[PDB]
């Protein structure tokens, strides 16, 4: 749902792939010009293999949180805990891990 890409979305059904890894392979074989995904993952990817480069800008501010259904008390506990990590370098430690 947007007006602008409507051309694009109209154009993008064709060559889309099942698993982004496959895309990495494909452009990695030059069978693709470019691929659309969320940044951090790809920073990791090209960060691994010299062959590829992040895009110029960064857009569609976004983030990751634990999937849980509807309403169950677990939400508060979980997120509270995740702050309970970000409070300290646990996350940065997670970089150090991966």
């Amino acid at each position: 749902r947007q007006v602008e890409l409507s051309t694009m979305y109209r154009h993008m059904e064709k060559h889309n792939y099942e698993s982004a890894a496959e895309a990495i392979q494909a452009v990695r074989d030059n069978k693709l010009h470019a691929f659309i995904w969320d940044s951090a993952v790809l920073e990791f990817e090209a960060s691994q293999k010299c062959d590829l480069v992040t895009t110029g800008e960064l857009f569609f501010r976004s983030g990751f949180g634990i999937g849980m259904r509807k309403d169950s008390p677990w939400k508060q506990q979980v997120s509270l805990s995740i702050l309970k990590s970000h409070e300290n370098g646990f996350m940065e430690d997670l970089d150090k891990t991966w």
Partner: protein
């Protein structure tokens, strides 16, 4: 009137009644230009305006000036910063110059005025078509203006009242002559209806009699000063036919400016007084008027700082406070030529106390609010469509836990002193458990900076 001239000799006339039917004053005014006779209605509907009098009439009334009537309406809008409004009239006189004054006032300023619509009712026909009812059903504002006779206003209030424009999120403001009388309330009037009038209590009826008497007095003194004669009044409306070319009336030019007793009564050439006394009127919960404000010396002093409002059963308004913080908040002084903040910028209040040893807590001075997070509140507002407020915050930049309490905005929520708040919120576990959170709309975190030499 004629017999009043035949019995005694009246160089002048004073008229008043308590009634609501202004046409009295209409044909009276007509007689003014008929007989070349100064006549002062001092009170009642006899004061109400009839648009575009004769160029030959001498007549006058005490009532707000149509242009500056709606202008007072404008400043009224300037009080609580009510931007979204409309205006509704019949074919009754004045609409043209009315609207002209409206928009002409609108577009000429840095102010952020936004006018949605204006529609024209028909009170001539009766209703099988609901056309009135329908185009009223086209009205989107929380408050709108209506210009018409009290009689017409009855039928309107009825039909629109069926349409559901009378609830919370709804209010109405009408000019003085609209509701007219103090003490006569058609029930179908909307609750908490708004208008403004010449002061009911502060302005005496006999006092007014003295007012006009003095007017004609010093006036005749002004012709007698210069000319030392006054045209002999024609005592018979019958015989008035031959005196047309005889009488040479210069009186008007002196009639206009009258300086007496320190309170200027002077009118203007269009049939209105320069600085008449004006008082804002608001309807109570008991359906009985009370003087809720006054407009004096081309200026306003309100009886309340913030608008009294009930909201029996829907709490659809909320409370918000934060500190202006670069960038995210703009706070500026309002423009002197208006008094509110301009453009898309939004209002806020200032709780600054004066002396440490006193309480004395109205504690508010309006000041500009705008900027980014402000606009976040804007988008969300126009999305879920609910009201919002903002004001300055007294204690600390953000907030902290001193001992058992919280000194700051978030804390200002947890004690229910305010419902919501904004600004730059570090979203932590610490402050978490006492409050609730959204998805964050900004990514940020601890960082340091120095200079590259």
């Amino acid at each position: 009137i004629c017999d009043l001239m035949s019995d005694r000799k009246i160089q002048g006339v004073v008229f008043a009644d308590d009634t609501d039917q202004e046409a009295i004053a209409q044909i009276l005014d007509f007689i003014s230009a008929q007989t070349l006779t100064p006549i002062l209605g001092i009170h009642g509907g006899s004061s109400m305006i009839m648009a575009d009098k004769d160029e030959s009439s001498m007549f006058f009334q005490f009532g707000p000036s149509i242009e500056q009537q709606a202008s007072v309406m404008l400043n009224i809008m300037e009080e609580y910063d009510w931007y979204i409004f409309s205006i509704v009239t019949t074919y009754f006189p004045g609409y043209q110059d009315f609207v002209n004054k409206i928009r002409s006032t609108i577009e000429n300023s840095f102010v952020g005025w936004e006018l949605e619509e204006v529609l024209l009712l028909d009170m001539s026909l009766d209703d099988g078509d609901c056309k009135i009812q329908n185009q009223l059903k086209k009205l989107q504002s929380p408050i709108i203006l209506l210009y018409c006779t009290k009689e017409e206003a009855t039928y309107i209030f009825e039909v629109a009242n069926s349409v559901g424009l009378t609830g919370y999120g709804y209010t109405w403001i009408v000019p003085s002559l609209v509701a007219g009388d103090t003490d006569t309330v058609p029930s179908e009037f909307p609750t908490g209806l708004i208008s403004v009038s010449y002061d009911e209590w502060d302005y005496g009826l006999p006092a007014r009699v003295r007012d006009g008497i003095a007017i004609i007095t010093t006036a005749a003194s002004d012709m007698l000063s210069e000319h030392s004669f006054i045209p002999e009044p024609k005592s018979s409306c019958y015989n008035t036919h031959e005196k047309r070319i005889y009488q040479s009336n210069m009186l008007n030019r002196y009639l206009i400016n009258v300086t007496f007793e320190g309170r200027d009564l002077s009118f203007s050439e269009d049939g209105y007084q320069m600085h008449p006394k004006l008082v804002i009127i608001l309807l109570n919960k008991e359906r009985k008027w009370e003087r809720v404000g006054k407009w004096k010396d081309k200026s306003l002093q309100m009886k309340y700082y913030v608008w009294p409002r009930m909201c029996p059963e829907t709490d659809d308004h909320l409370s918000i406070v934060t500190l202006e913080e670069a960038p995210f908040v703009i706070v500026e002084s309002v423009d002197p030529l208006s008094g509110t903040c301009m453009r898309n910028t939004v209002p806020c209040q200032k709780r600054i106390i004066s002396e440490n040893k006193t309480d004395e807590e109205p504690g508010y001075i309006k000041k500009c609010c705008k900027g980014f997070c402000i606009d976040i509140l804007k988008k969300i507002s126009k999305s879920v469509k609910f009201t919002y407020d903002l004001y300055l915050v007294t204690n600390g930049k953000h907030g902290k836990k001193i001992n058992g309490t919280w000194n700051g905005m978030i804390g200002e929520v947890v004690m229910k002193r305010a419902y919501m708040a904004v600004g730059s919120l570090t979203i932590n576990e610490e402050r978490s458990e006492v409050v609730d959170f959204s998805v964050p709309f900004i990514e940020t975190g601890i960082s340091v900076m120095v200079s590259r030499s």
